[PDB]
Symmetry: C3
Subunit: 116 residues, 3 copies
């Protein structure tokens, strides 16, 4: 079904190494449990200090882009969002009402120099 | 039709708070008038100082990624691009010939910890 | 077929001007030879110093997002990935096993203030 998951987290707050490590840990679990495979591997990029505007405010907000090969079973993104958002709230203090999560997928994506 | 619009603006110039606030204002109008709903809310992320190369030049250029739930009525992106590009030119001095705008959408996207 | 190609390169290492210029040169060739048209033009954005986690490690890794108008002939992404990854390894020392490349496309995308 879904493979090679990549998450980009864009946040207006500053993150440090502990918080990125904690986020990567959380995302990895969420991906393993909700997206499919235990032994899966997950790539996780953090763009912090990125100003974000939302509802007329620049208070801390987040956007996460989830990508993967194939296409999603329609139940899985529903299960993932509240976990992703909870993990962002815990590590970053950003309330869920200022967190956007979008999921995309493709048939074309490549790793170790060879497409899936 | 189209919901929960997110714009990421990637620019090679430096932006300050006034210019991001002006861009967020402009995007909000463009989204409300062209994309659908008045009371809509719009998330707007600014990655400035990001080097961009184009036509063999690294002079100031821009890329904007527009995302939203569902799929676009085919007339709306056509209407949005010239407004987005005009707003970037005004706030950033980037000529329209170095501005790329791409639109994506998904059926899976989530807010306040719950998918749309 | 495929038009207006945009590449975003996200790397956890620092890039300098020579290395971005070399990457933009390489991407341009790869796009011209594999994606379609000689006289094509290619936009290339570099987000360096972006922490990335993968397989439990934050050693240097890369993610590249390739975007373009239309949709891909299914052979072309297969041909592009190993070139993109080779170019990243050469300029950045990142081994191919920590390089992800994803390809997306849209029917809606705009330049010089007018959609394709």
């Amino acid at each position: 079904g879904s493979h090679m998951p990549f998450l980009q987290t864009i946040v207006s707050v500053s993150l440090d190494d502990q918080k990125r490590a904690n986020l990567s840990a959380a995302y990895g679990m969420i991906c393993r449990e909700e997206l499919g495979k235990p032994e899966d591997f997950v790539m996780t990029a953090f763009s912090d200090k990125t100003p974000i505007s939302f509802q007329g405010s620049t208070a801390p907000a987040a956007y996460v882009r989830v990508e993967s090969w194939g296409e999603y079973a329609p139940s899985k993104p529903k299960m993932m969002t509240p976990r992703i958002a909870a993990a962002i709230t815990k590590e970053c203090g950003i309330p869920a009402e200022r967190i956007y999560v979008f999921y995309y997928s493709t048939k074309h994506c490549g790793w170790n120099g060879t497409n899936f």
